[PDB]
Scaffold this active site. Structure first.
Site, short mmCIF file in Angstrom:
data_model
loop_
_atom_site.label_atom_id
_atom_site.label_comp_id
_atom_site.label_asym_id
_atom_site.label_seq_id
_atom_site.Cartn_x
_atom_site.Cartn_y
_atom_site.Cartn_z
N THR I 1 0.93 -1.22 -0.08
CA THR I 1 0.15 0.11 0.09
C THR I 1 0.96 1.22 0.00
O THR I 1 1.96 1.29 0.62
CB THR I 1 -0.84 -0.06 1.26
OG1 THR I 1 -1.84 -1.07 0.83
CG2 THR I 1 -1.55 1.45 1.52
C1 LIG Z 1 -1.83 -2.15 2.00
O1 LIG Z 1 -1.27 -1.72 3.24
C2 LIG Z 1 -3.51 -2.52 2.13
C3 LIG Z 1 -4.23 -1.36 2.67
C4 LIG Z 1 -5.58 -1.86 2.87
C5 LIG Z 1 -6.37 -0.70 3.76
C6 LIG Z 1 -6.45 -2.17 1.84
N1 LIG Z 1 -3.43 -3.54 2.89
C7 LIG Z 1 -3.48 -5.01 2.67
O2 LIG Z 1 -3.57 -5.28 1.41
C8 LIG Z 1 -3.44 -5.81 3.73
C9 LIG Z 1 -1.98 -6.11 4.09
C10 LIG Z 1 -1.96 -7.41 5.13
C11 LIG Z 1 -0.40 -7.71 5.05
C12 LIG Z 1 -2.41 -6.88 6.55
N2 LIG Z 1 -4.22 -7.03 3.25
C13 LIG Z 1 -5.43 -7.39 4.13
O3 LIG Z 1 -5.82 -6.84 5.11
C14 LIG Z 1 -6.04 -8.64 3.58
C15 LIG Z 1 -7.05 -8.17 2.85
C16 LIG Z 1 -8.28 -9.16 2.60
C17 LIG Z 1 -9.54 -8.88 1.67
C18 LIG Z 1 -7.81 -10.53 2.02
N3 LIG Z 1 -6.54 -9.36 4.89
C19 LIG Z 1 -5.90 -10.33 5.56
O4 LIG Z 1 -5.07 -10.83 4.95
O5 LIG Z 1 -6.56 -11.02 6.61
C20 LIG Z 1 -5.60 -11.50 7.76
C21 LIG Z 1 -5.00 -10.14 8.44
C22 LIG Z 1 -5.96 -9.79 9.37
C23 LIG Z 1 -5.31 -8.62 10.10
C24 LIG Z 1 -4.27 -8.24 9.91
C25 LIG Z 1 -3.35 -8.82 8.89
C26 LIG Z 1 -3.66 -10.03 8.19
#
Ligand SMILES: *[C@@H](O)[C@H](CC(C)C)NC(=O)[C@H](CC(C)C)NC(=O)[C@H](CC(C)C)NC(=O)OCc1ccccc1
Ligand SMILES: *[C@@H](O)[C@H](CC(C)C)NC(=O)[C@H](CC(C)C)NC(=O)[C@H](CC(C)C)NC(=O)OCc1ccccc1
Ligand SMILES: *[C@@H](O)[C@H](CC(C)C)NC(=O)[C@H](CC(C)C)NC(=O)[C@H](CC(C)C)NC(=O)OCc1ccccc1
Ligand SMILES: *[C@@H](O)[C@H](CC(C)C)NC(=O)[C@H](CC(C)C)NC(=O)[C@H](CC(C)C)NC(=O)OCc1ccccc1
Ligand SMILES: [Cl-]
Ligand SMILES: [Cl-]
Ligand SMILES: [Mg+2]
Ligand SMILES: [Mg+2]
Ligand SMILES: [Mg+2]
Ligand SMILES: [Mg+2]
Ligand SMILES: [Mg+2]
Lengths: 196, 195, 226, 222, 204, 233, 212, 195, 196
Positions: I1
Site C-alpha cells: 500500500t
Molecule cells: C496495503 O497496506 C493494504 C491497505 C488496505 C487498507 C487495503 N493492505 C492490505 O492489502 C492488507 C495487507 C496485509 C499484510 C495486512 N491485506 C489485508 O488486510 C487482507 C485483505 C483481505 C480482503 C484478504 N486481509 C488479510 O490478509 O486478513 C488477515 C489479516 C488480518 C489482520 C491483519 C493482517 C492480516
C-alpha cells in the site's frame, strides 16, 4: 549502510557512508566501506563486516594471483570470483557487495551481488539498509553518460537522503573515482551534505 | 535395571541385585542375574539403560579374561576398577555414551582384604564399606550408617542386607521381585540360593 | 573491562583496567590485560579471558617464528591478519575482542579486532563493557597532533571513566607506550586509585582455635638411599 | 515480552545487640552494568522505633516500605496511638507479602528494633512472607559473602578455646554497639571488594531506647 | 544438570611468610545424596600441589593426566616441575579441550625450590590463569570463600597462624553450602616440610 | 504487554549551584527509520518543572495529556494556584511514579523512561528518575537509554558528588550538557543533530531553548583513514 | 527439610530438622519447621516456607474460632480437613506444602493426618515428609514398636532426623523434639547436629564410615 | 491411585481396590481404603489424581445422603450412576476438571439384581458384568472373558477375583500392597477382612 | 500500500494506490483506500483492511453525532477520535491511518497516525509499505504552498515510484482534492503514470 556505484562518461564512481553499528551503538563512525581488490577494481561492502572483509581479502588474493599469470583481470572476472564465494557459501554468509571497475576496452562497469549470490550487471547500483529510501530518488534522477561533476552530485545527494532516514547509515560520505586518469578519493563531511 | 547393593565386611564382599526385568507396562522376567564374573575373585553388578548394561558388562568381562590369559595372573580389584572407570570416563564424551552404573566387589589375594568399588556412568569411582546405585541408597544408607561395622562376619553382613531389602520392599513403589545375593571372598565367588 | 588505544605524534599508547569477573563476583582485582605479541607489538583483550590469552600466545608464537624466518622485525598488519583469519574460521566461538597496537619499520599502527573476524582502523579506539564510558572521554578530549604525555593522560582518563562508571571494570590502570625508534615501556599499575582502607579489626585467631582430628607428615621427597 | 521484574542490586545487614539493634545497607543503585545512583537511601525509619529495608527490585521495595509506613499510621488511628511492637510489625509484613503470593514483591525484607523487654531484635523475610526472628542476617546481592563471616565472628561458629582442642567451645560473650559497627564496616568493605554491585557508600541506622541514630561511611566507587 | 554442581566440593589456597597453604572439603555426592566423605580433591606431583573442584569424573581423570605428564617431564628434564611451569601446563591442557571442556576448577599451590618464593594460582574450566598474591578459591561455595578470605586474610602470616586463617575460611564457607562439607583437609607447605591436618567439622 | 513502536532516545540532565538542566533530541524513530524529525520530548509543567521523556511516543503523548489535565485539576477551587499551592516538581514526579508502577502491576506498562527536573518552593534542586517498571532513583546527574552509558560519565566528572553542586556554575553545567549531546550524536544510531534544552534556575526561572544544533564536530581525521588494515590507497 | 511423626503407647513423637535452602545456598540453620497451633495441636512444615507458615498460623485462628463457637476443643480430623479443603481451593495455583497435623483428643486418641498441597489427606500411624524422608523412614521402620517408652521413642525420632541430616544435603542444622500426650504437647529441646552427631557416634557405636 | 476392579455375579457385586498410596519415591501408606458408601446398597470405588479422588467421592456421598434424607428412600444404582456421570460430564468442560475414574457397585432391591457401572473422568458410563480402570483391565479382562458366568456364586466370584489379583501381582511393575475387597448384596455392604 | 496526503496553497490532497493483497495474490486491484469520515475530512488507510474499515466506520459515526450536537468538527478533532481508537486498542489493531481535512479557518491540515497510536501534525505525510521507497524523493521535492497542479504532479510522481518498487502497491492512483471549492475525485491509470 548506504552504498552505491554509478557508471558515467569517463568511467565509474563508488560511494558509501562510514557508519558501523552494534545494535544502536555506533562501533565506528569513520569506517571505510570502499575497498580495493585491484588497481582499478574496487567494491562496496554491506552486511556483516567480518564476512565482507574475509571475502574481499580472498578476492584480492585471487586477482593478485590472476594478474601474475594472465595479466590484468576484467571487472566481470572480479565479479565472478565474488559470486563464486557468495553463492557456494550462501548458508554461512551475510554479504551484499557491489563490484565496480574501469577497463580501457569496456570502460566503467558495475555489478551487484545480493544475498543469494546472484550477479546483475547494471548502469548503476544501490545497496545496504539505507538504499531502500532512495530507490525512488535514484530512478528519477539517474541518466546515462553523465559528467564527473554531475555523477558526484548524484551520489552525494542520494547518500545524503539515505543517511537522513536510515539510522544504520551516517558519518562522512566517502567516494572513489575510477577513470583512465587514475584513482581519486573524495570525502564529504556532515556540514556539507546535510544542508543539501 | 533397578536396585543393586554392595557391602564390604571383615573377610568378604556381598553384592545384592534385583531379579525383575520390566519393559514398559509388563514384567517380562523375574529371575534375571544382573552380574558378571570378571575374574575368579572379582564380581561386577550393573544397572542402567536396556541393552547397554549387558553389552558393557560382557565387554569388560572379555577384556579382563583376555588380560588373565595373556599374563597368567589375576588383576587386583583396584586395578580392575580403574580399568572400568577409564572405559566409562572415555564413554561419557562419545557419540553415544554407555548409560551404565556398576558396583565392583573383589577380594584382593595379595593384601588379604575385601574391596568394594562404586562407579557411575560418568566414570566417578569411590571405594566404600557399603554402596548402592539409583534410588536404592536413599533408603538403605541410613540403615547401614547405623548398623555397619568393619569387623562384621559374613553372616552378620547377610542379616544387615536382609534388613535393607525388607525396607526396600516396604517403601519402594516398584516390585523388583527380590534379589540374587552373591558373596566374594578368599575362596572365590558363590551364590546364596535361599534369600 | 575497559581497554583503549590512542595514537600520538611519534607512536601509539594502549591502556586497560585490572578487574576480572565471574558474573557479579570479582575473581581477580589486579588482572593483567596487556599482552605482548612481540617486543614492540602489544595488544589488550576483552571478552573471554582464556580466549584472549590463548589467541595472543598462538599468534605471538607464530609471529616470532615468522620474524626468525624472514630476518625482519614483525609488523602489526601481520599480527592483525593472522588474528582475524583465525577468529573468522571459528565463526565468533572464540570470544576474543582485541585492540592491537605497535611500531614497526612501516611506522606506528592501531587496530581493533572483533571476535567474528572484523578489523577497524583508528586514531582512538575502545573495547569492552566500559567502552562507551571510555569513548565518551575520547570523543570529548581527543585532538590531532597529540604529544606522548597528552596521549598517556587521555588514555588513562578514558580507562578511569570505565573504572568508576562501569561495574565490569575497576581497580587499577595499566599502560603500555610504543614510541618509534625506542623500546616499548610497559607501565604496570600506572595508577592505583583503589587501595583498600585499613580494616577496623584484626581477625588473627588464637593458636589452637580450630579442632583437629589427625596430624601427619607428608612425604614430598623422593625415595631415599640406604 | 514484557518483564515486570528487575534487579537493582544492593546489599543489607541487620545485627541484634543486647540492648540495641543495627540495620545497615549500601547506598548504590544499579541496573545491569550501569550505576543509577551512588547515594540512594535503602534503609528507612518507619516510626515506633522500627527500621526497615526491602532489598532487590527497588520498585517493589519502595512500594512495600510505603505500604508498611502506611500500616503504622493506621495502627495508631485504629488502636488509640498504641506503639506497634516489633513482633506485631513482623506479622503485619507477612500479610503484606503473602497478599501478593501469586505476583510477589521481589524483595528480601529485613526489619530491626527492640522487643517489648527492651532487647535488640531483627526479623528476616522471604519474598512471599515467611519470617523468623534472628540475631544476625544479611540480605541481597552479597549476602552469600557476608553471612559466613557473621556466623564466625558473631556466633563464634567453628571456634574453640585453645588448649582443649575442640572439646570446649568459645563462650558466646555479648557484643557492644562499637564492636558491632566494626563488624558491619568490615563486612561491607570486604563485600565491596569482591562484588561489583556493592560500593559507593554505607549507611547504618542504630536503634536504642533513646531513638534512631544514623551513621554514614564512604565505600569504594569502582 | 549443571555439571559443575552435581558432585559438589570446594578448594581454597593462601600465601604466607615463606609458606603456602591449600585446603579442601571431603564430600562427594549425587546432587542431594551424600555418597562419600573420603573424596580428597588435593593431589601433589613432587612439591607442586593441585586442588581440583567440579565434576568428580573429570577431577579423577585430570589427576591421572597430570601425574602422567609430570612423570614424563621429570624423566626428560631430570628435575621436578615447578609451580610456575605446572600452571602453564594445566592452562595448555585445559584449552586443548576448548569446545568440549573438562568441567573443573583447578587450583595450583607450591613453593619454587630455587627462588623460595611462595606461589598460588587458579583457573576457569577452559584455561584462564588467575595468579593472585593473596588467595585463590574454587568450588560450589566460591562466593562464600571469597567473603571469608577477603575479610580474614592478612599478608605475611606465619605457618601456624596461616593454618588457623585458612581452616576457618573453609569451615565457615562450607557450612553455608549444601553440597560442601563432610570433612576437610588442610596442607601447610614450607620449603622442605609439609604438614597435613584433618579438621573436625559438622557432618551434615 | 506491548512493544514500543515510535520511540524517543536519550534524555540527559544534571544539577548545578542554583538549579537544574535537562536536554533531549527532537527525533521520533520507527525502528531503524528516522521517521519524525520535529518531536518535542521536553514538556514543561508550570514555570518550575520540566518533564523529559524517552521511549514510546504514543505513551509520551498520553503522559503529556495527563500532566496538562493535572494543571487544570490543581487550579480548580484553588485561589493560590499561581502561588503557595502551585504544582511542585516533587508532586508531579510522585504522581507519575504512582501511575508507572500501577501500570506495570497490571502487566500493561507505559513504555517510557522519565526524568522530572525542577526547583522546589524553598529553592532546592529536584531531579528524579522513573521508568516503565516503576523504579525510581535520584542523583546529581541522571540520564536515560544511551545517555546512561555515555553522558553520565562525562557529567559526573563535573559533579561527582553532592558537595560539587554548589561549586558548579550554570555556564559550566550547560557546556557539559551540550558536549554530552554531541557525543551522543557521534555514537547513538537513533539520535538527531537537532535538540531542545531547558534550564530551571531559582533566580532566573525557566529558560526553554528550542532548535539547538550540535556544532563544533570533529570529522576531518576521517580523510586519513583508509581500508580496514592493510589497504594503503 | 525432613519431618516425621509417629503414634505409640505414650502418644505421639514429632521430630523435625532446622535447615532452609535457596538452591545450594544454605539460607538458615535455625528455622522452626514445627508450629504450635495450640496446647494440643502441632503442625509440621515442609515445602514452601511461606505457604506452610502462613496457612498453618491461619489454621490456628480457625481452630480458635471453632472452640469459641462450639465451646469444645476441635478434633484433629476437623482441623486437618479445614487446611486440606483450603489448599484444594488453591489447587493448580502453585502452593507447595507437605504437612502433618498432630494432636490428641478424648474421642480420637493420638491422631496424625498427612495434608498435602495436591489435596491429599491421609490418616496414619507413621509419616515422614521432606527431601530427606527416605533416610528417616529407614531408621523408623526397623526400630518402631507400639510398646515404646517416651524416652526411647523420643530418641528414635531424634536419631531418625540425624540419619537424614547426615545424608540429605538439604537437611540439617538442628533437631527440634516434641512429645504429644493426653495432657498436651511438651517441647524436648533444640539439639545441634554438629554436637549430636559426634555424641551419638561415640555412644551408639554407629557411623563407622565417618572418622572422628 | 492405581488398581480398582469390579465383578457382578448372580446375587452380588464385588469390588476390589488397592491399599497403596505412593507420593513420588515413597509409599506413604499400605492400608488405604479407596471407596465410599453412597447408600446402604450402593458402593463406589475410585482412582485418579491425588486430592481430587477423595474430594469427588465425598462430594457425591454427601449429595446421595442428602437425597436419602429428603425423600426417605434409597435411589437405584442406575439412578446414582446417572447422577455421577452427569457430574463428571459437567466437570470435563470446567476450568479445572475432576481427574477421577470410578466404579459403582450396587444391589437393586426393586429388581433383586446386582449392578456394576464403570464411569471414567470424561463421563463415559457403561453397565458391565465385570470392569476395571487404568492398566488393570489390560491384564484382568482376558481371565474374566474366559472364566466368568452370569450364574456364578459369591464364593466363585471371590476365587476368580483372587486369580485376577495373582496375575496383577505377577506382571505389574508397581507394588500396590494388596487389595481391600468389599461385597454388595441384598443384605448391604460388608468387607472381606482376609484376602 | 502506498498512501500520502499533501497540504498546498488552496487546501489538501489525499492520494493512494488501489491494491489489496493476500500474500502475493491481489484480492482486489481496484480498491478505494481514500475514505470519507466527514464532508471535508477524509482519511487514507493502510494495514489491515478489516481494522481500518471498522475504525473509519466508528469515526464517521462519532463525527456525524458530533455535527448533530456541536456543528462541523475540526480536522484536529477527527484525528483525536482516530487516535483514541488506535491508542486504546493498540494491542489488537494493525492500522496506519493518515487524516486530512479542510477548514476555512485552518485551511488544509494533515495528521498521521502510525501503529502505536501517536499523532503527528505535518505539512505532508506518507505511509504504507510502499512509502519506504519514496522518503528520499518526497523530502527532496516537497515545497510548501504549491499549486493544485504542482501538488497533483508531486503525488502522481511519488506514488508512481512507490508502485514501481513495492509489490504490495499497484493498480490505479486515486486522489481526492479538498478545497473551499468542494470535493474533487481524480483517477490515473497505469498507461499514464508508468511512463513518467
Ligand atoms: C496495503 O497496506 C493494504 C491497505 C488496505 C487498507 C487495503 N493492505 C492490505 O492489502 C492488507 C495487507 C496485509 C499484510 C495486512 N491485506 C489485508 O488486510 C487482507 C485483505 C483481505 C480482503 C484478504 N486481509 C488479510 O490478509 O486478513 C488477515 C489479516 C488480518 C489482520 C491483519 C493482517 C492480516
Ligand atoms: C552496514 O551494512 C554495515 C556495513 C559493514 C560492511 C561495515 N554493516 C554493519 O554495520 C553491520 C550490521 C549488522 C546488522 C550485520 N555490523 C556488523 O557487522 C558488526 C560490526 C562489529 C565491529 C560490531 N558486527 C556484528 O554485529 O557481529 C555479529 C554479526 C555477525 C555476522 C552477521 C551479523 C552480525
Ligand atoms: C572484561 O571484558 C574482561 C576481559 C578479560 C580479558 C579479563 N572479561 C572478563 O573478565 C570475562 C567476563 C565476560 C566478558 C566473559 N571473564 C571471564 O571470561 C572469566 C575469567 C575467569 C577469572 C573466570 N571466565 C569465566 O567466567 O569462565 C566461565 C566461562 C565458561 C565458558 C565460556 C567462557 C567463560
Ligand atoms: C524444607 O522443606 C524447608 C521447610 C521450611 C519450613 C523452611 N523448605 C525449604 O527449604 C524451601 C525449599 C523448597 C522451596 C525447594 N525453601 C523456601 O521455601 C525458601 C525459604 C527461604 C527462607 C530461604 N524460599 C525460597 O526459596 O524463595 C521463595 C521465592 C524465591 C524467589 C522468588 C519468589 C519466591
Ligand atoms: Cl568494515
Ligand atoms: Cl479496503
Ligand atoms: Mg543517520
Ligand atoms: Mg558414584
Ligand atoms: Mg564495588
Ligand atoms: Mg553443608
Ligand atoms: Mg546434610
Amino acid at each position: 549502510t548506504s552504498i552505491m556505484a554509478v557508471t558515467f562518461k569517463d568511467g565509474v564512481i563508488l560511494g558509501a557512508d562510514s557508519r558501523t553499528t552494534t545494535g544502536a551503538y555506533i562501533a565506528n563512525r569513520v569506517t571505510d566501506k570502499l575497498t580495493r581488490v585491484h588497481d582499478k577494481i574496487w567494491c562496496c561492502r554491506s552486511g556483516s563486516a567480518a564476512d565482507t572483509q574475509a571475502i574481499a581479502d580472498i578476492v584480492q588474493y585471487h586477482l593478485e594471483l590472476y594478474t601474475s599469470q594472465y595479466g590484468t583481470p576484467s571487472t566481470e572476472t572480479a565479479a565472478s570470483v565474488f559470486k563464486e564465494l557468495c553463492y557456494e557459501n550462501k548458508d554461512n554468509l551475510t554479504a551484499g557487495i557491489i563490484v565496480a571497475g574501469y577497463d580501457d576496452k569496456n570502460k566503467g562497469e558495475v555489478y551487484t551481488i545480493p544475498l543469494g549470490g546472484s550477479v546483475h550487471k547494471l548502469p548503476y547500483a544501490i545497496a545496504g539498509s539505507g538504499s531502500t529510501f532512495i530507490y525512488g530518488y535514484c530512478d528519477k534522477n539517474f541518466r546515462e553518460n553523465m559528467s564527473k561533476e554531475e555523477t558526484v552530485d548524484f551520489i552525494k545527494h542520494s547518500l545524503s537522503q539515505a543517511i537522513k532516514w536510515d539510522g544504520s547509515s551516517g558519518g562522512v560520505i566517502r567516494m572513489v573515482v575510477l577513470t583512465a586518469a587514475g584513482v581519486e578519493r573524495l570525502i564529504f563531511y556532515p556540514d556539507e551534505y546535510e544542508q543539501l | 535395571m533397578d536396585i543393586i547393593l554392595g557391602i564390604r565386611v571383615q573377610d568378604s564382599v556381598i553384592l545384592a541385585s534385583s531379579k525383575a526385568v520390566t519393559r514398559g507396562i509388563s514384567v517380562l522376567k523375574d529371575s534375571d542375574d544382573k552380574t558378571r564374573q570378571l575374574s575368579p575373585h572379582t564380581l561386577m553388578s550393573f544397572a542402567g539403560e536396556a541393552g547397554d548394561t549387558v553389552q558393557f558388562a560382557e565387554y569388560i568381562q572379555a577384556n579382563i579374561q583376555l588380560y588373565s590369559i595373556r599374563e597368567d595372573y589375576e588383576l587386583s580389584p583396584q586395578a580392575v576398577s580403574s580399568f572400568v572407570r577409564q572405559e566409562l570416563a572415555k564413554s561419557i564424551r562419545s557419540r553415544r555414551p554407555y548409560q551404565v552404573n556398576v558396583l565392583i566387589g573383589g577380594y584382593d589375594k595379595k593384601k588379604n582384604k575385601p574391596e568394594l568399588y562404586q562407579i557411575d556412568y560418568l566414570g566417578t569411582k569411590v571405594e566404600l564399606p557399603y554402596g548402592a546405585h539409583g534410588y536404592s541408597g536413599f533408603y538403605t544408607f541410613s540403615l547401614l550408617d547405623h548398623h555397619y561395622r568393619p569387623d562384621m562376619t559374613t553372616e552378620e553382613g547377610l542379616d544387615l542386607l536382609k534388613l535393607c531389602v525388607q525396607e526396600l520392599e516396604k517403601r519402594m513403589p516398584m516390585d523388583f521381585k527380590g534379589v540374587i545375593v552373591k558373596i566374594v571372598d578368599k575362596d572365590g565367588i558363590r551364590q546364596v540360593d535361599d534369600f | 573491562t575497559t581497554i583503549v588505544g590512542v595514537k600520538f605524534n611519534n607512536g601509539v599508547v594502549i591502556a586497560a583496567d585490572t578487574r576480572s569477573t565471574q558474573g557479579p563476583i570479582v575473581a581477580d582485582k589486579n588482572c593483567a590485560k596487556l599482552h605482548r605479541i612481540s617486543p614492540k607489538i602489544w595488544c589488550a583483550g576483552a571478552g573471554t579471558a582464556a580466549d584472549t590469552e590463548a589467541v595472543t600466545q598462538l599468534i605471538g608464537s607464530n609471529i616470532e617464528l615468522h620474524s626468525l624466518y624472514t630476518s625482519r622485525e614483525p609488523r602489526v598488519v601481520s599480527a592483525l591478519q593472522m588474528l582475524k583469519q583465525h577468529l573468522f574460521k571459528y565463526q565468533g566461538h572464540i570470544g576474543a575482542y582485541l585492540i592491537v597496537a605497535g611500531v614497526d619499520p612501516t611506522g606506528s599502527h592501531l587496530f581493533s579486532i572483533h571476535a567474528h573476524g572484523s578489523t577497524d582502523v583508528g586514531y582512538y579506539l575502545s573495547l569492552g563493557s566500559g567502552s562507551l564510558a571510555a569513548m565518551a572521554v575520547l570523543e570529548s578530549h581527543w585532538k590531532q597532533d597529540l604529544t606522548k604525555e597528552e596521549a598517556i593522560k587521555l588514555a588513562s582518563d578514558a580507562i578511569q571513566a570505565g573504572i568508576w562508571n562501569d561495574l565490569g571494570s575497576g581497580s587499577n590502570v595499566d599502560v603500555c607506550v610504543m614510541e618509534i625508534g625506542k623500546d616499548a615501556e610497559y607501565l604496570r599499575n600506572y595508577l592505583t586509585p583503589n587501595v583498600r582502607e585499613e580494616k577496623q579489626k584484626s581477625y588473627k585467631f588464637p593458636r589452637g582455635t580450630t579442632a583437629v582430628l589427625k596430624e601427619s607428615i607428608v612425604n614430598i621427597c623422593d625415595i631415599q638411599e640406604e | 515480552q514484557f518483564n515486570p521484574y528487575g534487579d537493582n542490586g544492593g546489599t543489607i545487614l541487620g545485627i541484634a545487640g543486647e540492648d540495641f539493634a543495627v540495620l545497615a545497607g549500601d547506598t548504590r543503585n544499579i541496573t545491569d552494568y550501569s550505576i543509577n545512583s551512588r547515594y540512594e537511601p535503602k534503609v528507612f525509619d518507619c516510626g515506633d522505633n522500627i527500621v526497615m529495608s526491602a532489598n532487590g527490585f527497588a520498585a517493589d521495595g519502595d512500594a512495600l516500605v510505603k505500604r508498611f509506613k502506611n500500616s503504622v499510621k493506621w495502627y495508631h488511628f485504629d488502636h488509640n496511638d498504641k506503639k506497634l511492637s516489633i513482633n506485631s510489625a513482623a506479622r503485619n509484613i507477612q500479610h503484606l507479602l503473602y497478599g501478593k503470593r501469586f505476583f510477589p514483591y521481589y524483595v528480601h525484607t529485613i526489619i530491626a528494633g527492640l522487643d517489648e523487654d527492651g532487647k535488640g531484635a531483627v526479623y528476616s523475610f522471604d519474598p512471599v512472607g515467611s519470617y523468623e526472628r534472628e540475631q544476625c542476617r544479611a540480605g541481597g546481592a552479597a549476602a552469600s559473602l557476608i553471612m559466613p563471616f557473621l556466623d564466625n565472628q558473631v556466633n563464634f561458629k567453628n571456634q574453640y578455646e585453645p588448649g582443649t582442642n575442640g572439646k570446649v567451645k568459645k563462650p558466646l560473650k555479648y557484643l557492644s554497639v562499637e564492636e558491632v559497627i566494626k563488624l558491619v564496616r568490615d563486612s561491607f568493605t570486604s563485600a565491596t571488594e569482591r562484588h561489583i554491585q556493592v560500593g559507593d557508600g554505607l549507611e547504618i541506622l542504630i536503634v536504642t531506647k533513646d531513638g534512631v541514630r544514623k551513621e554514614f561511611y564512604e565505600l569504594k566507587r569502582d | 544438570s549443571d555439571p559443575s554442581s552435581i558432585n559438589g566440593g570446594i578448594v581454597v589456597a593462601m600465601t604466607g611468610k615463606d609458606c603456602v597453604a591449600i585446603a579442601c572439603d571431603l564430600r562427594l555426592g549425587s546432587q542431594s545424596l551424600g555418597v562419600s566423605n573420603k573424596f580428597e580433591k588435593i593431589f601433589h606431583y613432587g612439591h607442586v600441589f593441585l586442588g581440583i573442584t567440579g565434576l568428580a569424573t573429570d577431577v579423577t581423570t585430570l589427576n591421572e593426566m597430570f601425574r602422567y605428564k609430570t612423570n614424563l617431564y621429570k624423566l626428560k628434564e631430570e628435575r621436578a616441575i615447578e609451580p610456575e611451569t605446572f600452571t602453564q601446563l594445566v592452562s595448555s591442557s585445559l584449552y586443548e579441550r576448548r569446545f568440549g571442556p573438562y568441567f573443573v576448577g583447578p587450583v595450583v599451590a607450591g613453593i619454587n625450590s630455587k627462588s623460595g618464593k611462595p606461589f598460588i594460582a587458579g583457573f576457569d574450566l577452559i584455561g584462564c590463569i588467575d595468579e593472585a598474591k593473596d588467595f585463590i578459591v574454587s568450588g560450589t561455595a566460591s562466593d562464600q570463600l571469597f567473603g571469608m578470605c577477603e575479610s580474614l586474610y592478612e599478608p605475611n602470616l606465619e605457618p601456624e597462624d596461616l593454618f588457623e586463617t585458612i581452616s576457618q575460611a573453609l569451615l565457615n564457607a562450607a557450612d553455608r553450602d549444601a553440597l560442601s562439607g563432610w570433612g576437610a583437609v588442610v596442607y601447610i607447605i614450607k620449603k622442605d616440610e609439609v604438614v597435613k591436618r584433618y579438621l573436625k567439622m559438622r557432618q551434615d | 504487554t506491548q512493544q514500543p513502536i515510535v520511540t524517543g532516545t536519550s534524555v540527559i540532565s544534571m544539577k548545578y549551584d542554583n538549579g537544574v538542566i535537562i536536554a533531549a533530541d527532537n527525533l521520533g524513530s520507527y525502528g531503524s527509520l528516522l521517521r519524525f524529525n520535529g518531536v518535542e520530548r521536553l514538556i514543561p509543567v508550570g514555570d518550575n518543572t520540566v518533564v523529559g521523556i524517552s521511549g514510546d511516543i504514543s505513551d509520551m503523548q498520553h503522559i503529556e495529556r495527563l500532566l496538562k489535565d493535572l494543571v487544570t485539576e490543581n487550579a480548580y477551587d484553588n485561589p493560590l494556584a499561581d502561588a503557595e499551592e502551585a504544582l511542585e516538581p516533587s508532586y508531579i514526579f510522585e504522581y507519575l511514579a504512582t501511575v508507572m508502577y500501577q501500570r506495570r502491576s497490571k502487566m500493561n506498562p507505559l513504555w517510557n523512561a522519565i526524568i522530572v527536573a525542577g526547583v522546589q518552593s524553598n529553592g532546592d534542586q529536584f531531579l528524579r528518575y522513573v521508568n516503565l517498571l516503576g523504579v525510581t532513583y535520584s542523583s546529581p546527574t541522571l540520564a536515560t537509554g544511551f545517555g546512561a552509558h555515555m553522558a553520565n560519565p562525562l557529567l559526573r566528572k563535573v559533579v561527582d558528588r553532592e558537595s560539587d553542586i554548589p561549586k558548579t556554575t550554570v555556564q559550566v553545567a550547560e557546556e557539559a550538557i551540550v558536549n554530552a549531546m554531541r557525543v551522543l550524536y557521534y555514537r547513538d544510531a537513533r539520535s538527531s543533530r537537532n535538540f531542545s534544552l531547558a534550564i530551571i534556575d531559582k533566580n532566573t526561572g525557566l529558560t526553554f531553548k528550542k532548535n539547538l544544533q550540535v556544532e563544533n564536530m570533529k570529522w576531518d581525521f576521517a580523510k586519513d583513514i583508509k581500508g580496514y588494515g592493510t589497504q594503503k590507497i | 527439610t525432613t519431618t516425621l511423626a509417629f503414634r505409640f503407647q505414650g502418644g505421639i513423637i514429632v521430630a523435625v530438622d532446622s535447615r532452609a535452602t535457596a538452591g545450594n545456598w544454605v539460607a538458615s540453620q535455625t528455622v522452626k519447621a514445627v508450629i504450635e497451633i495450640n496446647p494440643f495441636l502441632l503442625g509440621t512444615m515442609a515445602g514452601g516456607a511461606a505457604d506452610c507458615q502462613f496457612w498453618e498460623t491461619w489454621l490456628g485462628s480457625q481452630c480458635r474460632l471453632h472452640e469459641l463457637r462450639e465451646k469444645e476443643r476441635i478434633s484433629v480430623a476437623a482441623a486437618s480437613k479445614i487446611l486440606s479443603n483450603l489448599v484444594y481451593q488453591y489447587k493448580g495455583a502453585g502452593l507447595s506444602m507437605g504437612t502433618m497435623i498432630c494432636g490428641y483428643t478424648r474421642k480420637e486418641g493420638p491422631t496424625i493426618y498427612y495434608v498435602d498441597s495436591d489435596g491429599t489427606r491421609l490418616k496414619g500411624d507413621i509419616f515422614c515428609v521432606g527431601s530427606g524422608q527416605t533416610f528417616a523412614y529407614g531408621v523408623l521402620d526397623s526400630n518402631y514398636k507400639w510398646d515404646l517408652s517416651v524416652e526411647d521413642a523420643l530418641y528414635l525420632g531424634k536419631r531418625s532426623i540425624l540419619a537424614a541430616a547426615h545424608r540429605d544435603a538439604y537437611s540439617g542444622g538442628s533437631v527440634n523434639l516434641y512429645h504429644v500426650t493426653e495432657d498436651g504437647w511438651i517441647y524436648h529441646g533444640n539439639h545441634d547436629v554438629g554436637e549430636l552427631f559426634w555424641k551419638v557416634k561415640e555412644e551408639e557405636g554407629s557411623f563407622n564410615n565417618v572418622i572422628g
